[PDB]
Ligand binder design. Sequence first.
Ligand SMILES: [Cl-]
Ligand SMILES: [Cl-]
Ligand SMILES: [Cl-]
Ligand SMILES: [Cl-]
Ligand SMILES: [Cl-]
Ligand SMILES: [Cl-]
Ligand SMILES: [Cl-]
Ligand SMILES: [Cl-]
Ligand code: NA
Length: 129
Amino acid sequence: KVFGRCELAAAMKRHGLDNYRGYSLGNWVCAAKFESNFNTQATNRNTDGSTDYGILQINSRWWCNDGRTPGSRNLCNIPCSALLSSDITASVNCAKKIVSDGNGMNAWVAWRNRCKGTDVQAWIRGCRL
Ligand SMILES: [Cl-]
Ligand SMILES: [Cl-]
Ligand SMILES: [Cl-]
Ligand SMILES: [Cl-]
Ligand SMILES: [Cl-]
Ligand SMILES: [Cl-]
Ligand SMILES: [Cl-]
Ligand SMILES: [Cl-]
Ligand code: NA
């Protein structure tokens, strides 16, 4: 599923991501934009052989199991495929665990490079939330 900007904002808010670990909703929408362009089915292979999955491009090296990332962990205890669903629940619950692990949203490289320090509020501007 390819989300609209305000549509994703609303789904994110409903699943408790808004100001989770102090990160306003705009941060999460901006990260989703540049990680997946709002596409729940986005996948991308990393050089090390791991793969990033879903609207927030969660990586198989640590967070989910895809059966082909030798020596990886599955800290969110989910198949990586579950992160590709039109329902964002699994991606949200995993993101909550990721953003809590010490480095905040810097875990998402696109967020650090393209969202951090910017007017993230622009991403939820105009949305009926
Ligand atoms: Cl947009
Ligand atoms: Cl915001
Ligand atoms: Cl394969
Ligand atoms: Cl594996
Ligand atoms: Cl594990
Ligand atoms: Cl699995
Ligand atoms: Cl949803
Ligand atoms: Cl933080
Ligand atoms: Na894994």
